[PDB]
Every structure is written in C-alpha cells, then in structure tokens.
Design a protein around this ligand. Sequence first.
Ligand SMILES: [Mg+2]
Ligand SMILES: [Mg+2]
Ligand SMILES: [Mg+2]
Ligand SMILES: [Mg+2]
Ligand SMILES: [Mg+2]
Ligand SMILES: [Mg+2]
Ligand SMILES: [Mg+2]
Ligand SMILES: [Mg+2]
Ligand SMILES: [Mg+2]
Ligand SMILES: [Mg+2]
Ligand SMILES: [Mg+2]
Ligand SMILES: [Mg+2]
Ligand SMILES: [Mg+2]
Ligand SMILES: [Mg+2]
Ligand SMILES: [Mg+2]
Ligand SMILES: [Mg+2]
Ligand SMILES: [Mg+2]
Ligand SMILES: [Mg+2]
Ligand SMILES: [Mg+2]
Ligand SMILES: [Mg+2]
Ligand SMILES: [Mg+2]
Ligand SMILES: [Mg+2]
Ligand SMILES: [Mg+2]
Ligand SMILES: [Mg+2]
Ligand SMILES: [Mg+2]
Ligand SMILES: [Zn+2]
Lengths: 50, 85, 71, 119, 52
Amino acid sequence: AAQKSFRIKQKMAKAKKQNRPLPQWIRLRTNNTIRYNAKRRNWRRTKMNI
Amino acid sequence: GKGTPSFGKRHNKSHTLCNRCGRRSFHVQKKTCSSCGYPAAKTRSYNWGAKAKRRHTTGTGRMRYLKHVSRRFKNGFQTGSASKA
Amino acid sequence: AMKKVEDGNILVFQVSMKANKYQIKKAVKELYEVDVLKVNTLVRPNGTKKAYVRLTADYDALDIANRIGYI
Amino acid sequence: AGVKAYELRTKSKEQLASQLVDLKKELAELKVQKLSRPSLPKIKTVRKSIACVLTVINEQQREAVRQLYKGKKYQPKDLRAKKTRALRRALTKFEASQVTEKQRKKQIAFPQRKYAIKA
Amino acid sequence: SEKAGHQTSAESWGTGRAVARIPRVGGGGTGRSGQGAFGNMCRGGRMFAPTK
RNA sequence: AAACUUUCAACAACGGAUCUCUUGGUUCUCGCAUCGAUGAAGAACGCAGCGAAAUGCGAUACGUAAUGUGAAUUGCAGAAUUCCGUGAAUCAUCGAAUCUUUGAACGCACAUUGCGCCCCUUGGUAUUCCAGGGGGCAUGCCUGUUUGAGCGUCAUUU
RNA sequence: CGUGGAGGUCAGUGACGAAGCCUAGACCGUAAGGUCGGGUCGAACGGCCUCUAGUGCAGAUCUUGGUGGUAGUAGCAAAUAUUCAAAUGAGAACUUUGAAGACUGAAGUGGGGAAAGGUUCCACGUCAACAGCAGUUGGACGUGGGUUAGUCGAUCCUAAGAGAUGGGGAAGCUCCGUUUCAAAGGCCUGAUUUUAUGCAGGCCACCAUCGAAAGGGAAUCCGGUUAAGAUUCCGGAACCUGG
RNA sequence: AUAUUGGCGAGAGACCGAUAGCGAACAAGUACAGUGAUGGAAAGAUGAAAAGAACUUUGAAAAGAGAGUGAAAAAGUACGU
Ligand SMILES: [Mg+2]
Ligand SMILES: [Mg+2]
Ligand SMILES: [Mg+2]
Ligand SMILES: [Mg+2]
Ligand SMILES: [Mg+2]
Ligand SMILES: [Mg+2]
Ligand SMILES: [Mg+2]
Ligand SMILES: [Mg+2]
Ligand SMILES: [Mg+2]
Ligand SMILES: [Mg+2]
Ligand SMILES: [Mg+2]
Ligand SMILES: [Mg+2]
Ligand SMILES: [Mg+2]
Ligand SMILES: [Mg+2]
Ligand SMILES: [Mg+2]
Ligand SMILES: [Mg+2]
Ligand SMILES: [Mg+2]
Ligand SMILES: [Mg+2]
Ligand SMILES: [Mg+2]
Ligand SMILES: [Mg+2]
Ligand SMILES: [Mg+2]
Ligand SMILES: [Mg+2]
Ligand SMILES: [Mg+2]
Ligand SMILES: [Mg+2]
Ligand SMILES: [Mg+2]
Ligand SMILES: [Zn+2]
C-alpha cells in the first residue's frame, strides 16, 4: 500500500527499529540469562496482522 | 473450488485498530470494536470469559496513578514537606 | 546530506515531529541569523522528521556549516 | 557537577531565564559534537541542570500565586489537597459534629457517668 | 486449587479420526493445540479426586 | 572361512529419565479499608554513552525537587572533587513538580495526526487576511445572579 | 514385600565419598524383595517401634517426550535448452564478463499502477543456518544510506446508507426515529466612535455530522540530476486561490 | 457480634517439587494461529571463582593434535548427575 495512513507508518517505524539483534555487551553482564532476541520478526515468516 | 482457489481472493480488510484497545478489532462497516466495544461508554467484558477478563483486568498495565495510592494511605495523606532535621 | 551542503547551498536538520514549516523557518532565522529561501520536509522511515532548508544567495551553507561546528 | 538547587533558590527570575538559555545553547553545541565523537557522557549533567532550573522556576511561580490567593476561599482546582475522591466529597467535621438542639440539650442533661462496682 | 487443569476450552474430536477419544484443546498453530486435557492421565490435566 | 544376522560385555554415541537442589506455586490464619472530571483502570508512541526485551519514566523522559544514610555504579570507557561533606548511589524514604497522544474523554469528528470558534499577546505597512505563543468552547442536573416570554393573572395610569 | 511424607529411637551411616547409575561377579528368601563386591559420581541418607497417603503398570486406537524397521528406497521428470573461454575463489554446471545458440513475440517472460505487503529498495562485509543439489551468489546474515509538492492525492460535496440532538419505549444493556408534535439563529446594514459593543434597523426557515485514494473537484510543464528520490530537487518558463 | 478465591500488609503447613505445583519457578498472559469473539505454548542447574583454554603445530576455515587453568575438562558455554 503506497498510500498509507500516519498511524500505519508509525507502526512501520517502530517495527523497523525493533528488528535488531542483541546489543552484544548484554551477554557479559552479571547474572545474565538472555541468550538471543527471542522476539525477532521477519517479513517472510510472520506477518504483522495490523 | 471452494477452498484453495477461493482463498486467493481475500484482500479486503474488515477489522482495523481500535483507538482504545489497539487490538485491530474495529469492525468498520459497523464502526464497533469487538474487544472494547469502543464507541459504547463502558468496557465490553463478560463473566463467562474468565481468561478474557484476566487478559485486561487492572494490574496488567502501568497503573500510572494507582501505584502510589497505598503509599499515600499508609502515610496518611500528609501535606507540607520534610523538615531537614 | 554533506554533499547537499556544499553543492545545493542546503542545510539538513532533524526536527521534532510537532514542528511545521513556519516554525522551522522562524527557528532557523533566529538561531543562525541567516535568511532562508524555502523549507522542504519529510518523515524518514524511522519516524523522525527531516527538513531540508535552502538559503538565499546572500549566505553560504558551507560557511555557516563549520560555524555551527560540523564539517 | 551541574547546578545545585540550594543556591539556585536564591537567584531571581531574570538570572534564571538567562541561565536556562545558556544551558540550552550549551546543550545544542555539545550535541553537535556528540555525533562525531564516538562517546560523550557530558550530556547527563546538562540535562539534569535543565531539569533542576525548570523545577526551581515552577516552585517560584506556584509559591507566588499561592501567596496571592492566600487567606481567601476559592483557590484554583489544583492547589488544594489531592487527597481522594471520597475524602473530598465527605462531610467535614464541622457538620459531622452538628447536632440538633434537642440532642445537645439531652446530652448535657444526662451524660454517661463514670462509675465502678467494688463497694 | 479448584481450578486445576480446567482453565481451558477443550473438547473431544470423537471417533473416526484414528485417535483417542480424550477431549482435546482447540485452536491451532501453537504446539499446544491438539494435545489432550481434562483427564487424570493427560499431561497437565486435573488430578484424581482433587484433595478437598 | 569371511561378510551378514542375533545375544552379552567395555568404550564412544543419540536422549534427557533418575538423584539431589528451589527467589515459584497451593491452602490456612491474622490485620487493615485506600480508585476516578483536581481526569481512573486501559491503549499507542516515545526516553539511556553504548538497548532488542522485562522493569522504570513522559520532551524536566531508566528521571527533577525533598528527607535519611554516608562512599560508590560495573559489562566497557567516563566522572571524579563529591570524600573530617548541604555529599556518590539503578540506595532507601517521599509530603514538592513534569506528566507526550489517548482513554468515562469534554469545541465538532476520527480508517484522517481533519475542520472549527472565542479571549489576551507578537510579527507580517492590519479590527476584517496570514502566522507564532498563552488561556478558553461537552451533556444532564441543583442553588443563586442577570436577561427574558405568555390577555395565566393583579394593581396603577390617562 | 516395596514407595512419598510424620512422631520416637539406633549419642545410626558420610567429602578417608551419602544419593543415584552400570555390572551373563557373589550371598539370603518360594516370592514380593533384601544384602555385598567392582566401576562412575559428587552431598546428603538408612535400620527398628509407630502414624498418614496423590503408594506399586504392558496394555486403555491411553497422555507427553524420544527413537527405530521400512531405506540411502519411494523419489527430486509440466512450462522446447543450453554451450566455449577468461576472470574471481581452496573450491565453479549453477557467480561475473565476453562469444554463440535459443525463447517470451506488444490479450509479452515488456513498461507502470489500485488491494495487500512493510524495508523486501540501494551500497559495503560476509556464508553457521535457508534457497528440498551446489553455491564465491540472493528477496538469506551483519552494518549502514534512501521517500522533499501552493499545482500529484487525501482533506472538500453528495449518492446507496450510518447516525446525535427535540422526543417516545423498555426493569435494563439500550430500541425507534433524521425534520420528525422543539421557544432548534446568524446575516447584513449602520450607531456610539468614552468603547467595547449592546443600544438604531431590516433580512431570512431550511435546519448537526460521517459516508468515494475509480463518482463531482482551482491551479505545472520541459530538460538535467543520484546507488537508491522526483509532475516533489536543480535550471528555465507558467498558472490558481486569499490579501 | 456476621461474609469475603478481590486489594494492601503480615504469619504458617504430616501440601507439590520443573510431564507435580497457577497456564506462567525463565523477557507468560510473552512467543504463536484465527477477520473475530477467543484460543495459548516450550523453556530452571558448568565451576568456589571464568581461573571460559596463553603459546606451538596441520588445516582455506570450521576444526584437530599438542600445551595450560582447574580437584575434577569422566565439568569446555551442544556445559551436574
Ligand atoms: Mg471479494
Ligand atoms: Mg465487507
Ligand atoms: Mg510531504
Ligand atoms: Mg547390559
Ligand atoms: Mg557411593
Ligand atoms: Mg554440589
Ligand atoms: Mg493414582
Ligand atoms: Mg507402559
Ligand atoms: Mg494388565
Ligand atoms: Mg499407543
Ligand atoms: Mg527403484
Ligand atoms: Mg530413486
Ligand atoms: Mg514424478
Ligand atoms: Mg488492450
Ligand atoms: Mg514501480
Ligand atoms: Mg541442497
Ligand atoms: Mg552448502
Ligand atoms: Mg536487493
Ligand atoms: Mg439510533
Ligand atoms: Mg466528508
Ligand atoms: Mg497543468
Ligand atoms: Mg524509481
Ligand atoms: Mg522549481
Ligand atoms: Mg567429577
Ligand atoms: Mg557431573
Ligand atoms: Zn478496542
């Protein structure tokens, strides 16, 4: 949809920011259990339903 | 071919985002949220949907104002400020 | 953006979403006492408002660039 | 470093506004360097100074208006007590202890005496 | 707890599909869909004669 | 006779049972009574030197002010004068403030960041046009003020 | 006979190895089972007298999880089809360049769009997984860059319709109804120029709002320009609305 | 004087012990499917301390063989048993 509403574009931007792997230095912190960004999204595997 | 060949035709959205719930359940041709019943005054919730109520009841949000009520009650709603002993 | 400056006499700024062309115009005019020709805006895909500003011939974008402090 | 509230309390409005604009200017000038320099923690002190200065301004203003309405009723809807809803809507002790003439007379006549049973 | 193993909406698939007649959870696409519940033998189902 | 098949044993495999742990859960008892038009519960979007989440926060944005404690935080660099001190801390406490866009949601609407109106102020040679800033404009209801309407009706005029 | 827990007792056992696990090694009982030696391991456990129970598995097309024989088998065969040399690389049928042979044949395998998709676009590095073979390649992975309007659209009007207010039903969430049984207003003109604006006038009956990215509608073209943007930028030349 | 699976603050158990116990001992009402009402998971444990394997050698590289820390690498981030 080339003609899209501002709210949709806002969601677009947020998703684009969220799509990212871990800032690696997290894995060094004390008592860290995080391993990978389990909530990553990909445009071929899981549609947004918005 | 009522199955797979038909499934190719579905490209017109019926529900979109609710200004209140933000769940994409706003049936447009009726102008009504399914989850919130947005245009209506009160929230749309029912007693049989236990999990439904549990997914939205109080305490699952930020409680931007309710969190400090207990603190204020404990301290008796004092006014003024400390005294710098 | 750097190319734009020394070629088009253009400055590039990121501006708060609530701003509008009038507000950018007046703000630049008083922040840098430069005379502005026109303002041209858009929203980048990351949700920030990018504004190109074109200054009249009486001023040099490059000359004020290093004065602002980035070059 | 940064500014300290206790000596900021002493200055007057004009000095405050001038200081605030100086701090904003310094913030922008430091921000522009930040994008080229890989890392630059001096943001924190500047922004906290902004916060402190604005807070001092706000206290000064509200104190002034509080004095201006001091000692007379009907002061604005957000300077009085934000206790609750119910507490605001309940009776104040003045009327809560209001009693009819008949009741007051009867209580004065026959108060509950204080007695004991040993002998 | 009284509500043990019942906070769901399962039901039987009935015969004819070469599976057990245990009631099973609906839905789909989440790994939990299709397993059993409500049974003393089901994983995560209620116990026998819940202690009162 | 080998290979092949089968059984058992040692070692190496696949798999995570068993054993032992537990900041969790479950039930019982005791005490307390505190949400919201001064804008609640809830939602969206944003905020960090280096962040995706959880947690915290609202353009004063992992926070400001106030009090107490009295030397840190930590994954890396930085800050150190703040160390016999109106003073570190993602500390504790918490009475002062900010509180984006929303939300019963309140100028009119909303699949839009749409369209109004009033007051004060600033510039554009301006009461009328354009623009910037600040403050305003819901409904039902109660008491009161002010202005009204009806041959419903009273008196008084010529 | 055995199991999870409880009261008592053996001043019970143990980092000089408790619990568990393996052992065609041993002993005891008809059995349920118990006991020992050897290896492995690393932190608690047992006997006896009593108490209590969510207490003993082969099955239930049982439930969850795991793994086989089948088997390196079925198979990987529509859309006419590929070939030579060089370059790159450890590696080349599958990457690039050149050379050749081909097809789509303008109701195209071409050039743009609407619904939807949401960074796939473009650049740099890179191949653990994905592209049911390969892979130096990619719509994959990692780090970044990129979308510019007075004139293109939305917003503006109304259609089929939806829907407040005045009102009337219903115990009630709420239902009807759209100019309806309503006291449903703003408009010009001047006046005063203390002065904001009532005080002078006259006018007018309909009477909210939403509802089209293909209906109605004010206005822009040409050349050039990037890795990616253009009727949006640059250059030149115009037009509309409001004052 | 009585009720109370909600809220807030406390105290306990002949309760369960990671397929049990709330569904959730973890970034759980999250990941995920459905237009929607709704449906809804899996996943706890190296070691006292990272001391998380310097250096050599074969390999394009992943890796391997040595060397080394550790009481143990029959603990090597595919980490107790
Ligand atoms: Mg259709
Ligand atoms: Mg439809
Ligand atoms: Mg634009
Ligand atoms: Mg054996
Ligand atoms: Mg042993
Ligand atoms: Mg141990
Ligand atoms: Mg049983
Ligand atoms: Mg069995
Ligand atoms: Mg049997
Ligand atoms: Mg079976
Ligand atoms: Mg064959
Ligand atoms: Mg074959
Ligand atoms: Mg075939
Ligand atoms: Mg044609
Ligand atoms: Mg195209
Ligand atoms: Mg393959
Ligand atoms: Mg391969
Ligand atoms: Mg591409
Ligand atoms: Mg209606
Ligand atoms: Mg319209
Ligand atoms: Mg034209
Ligand atoms: Mg293009
Ligand atoms: Mg031009
Ligand atoms: Mg060992
Ligand atoms: Mg071990
Ligand atoms: Zn909703």
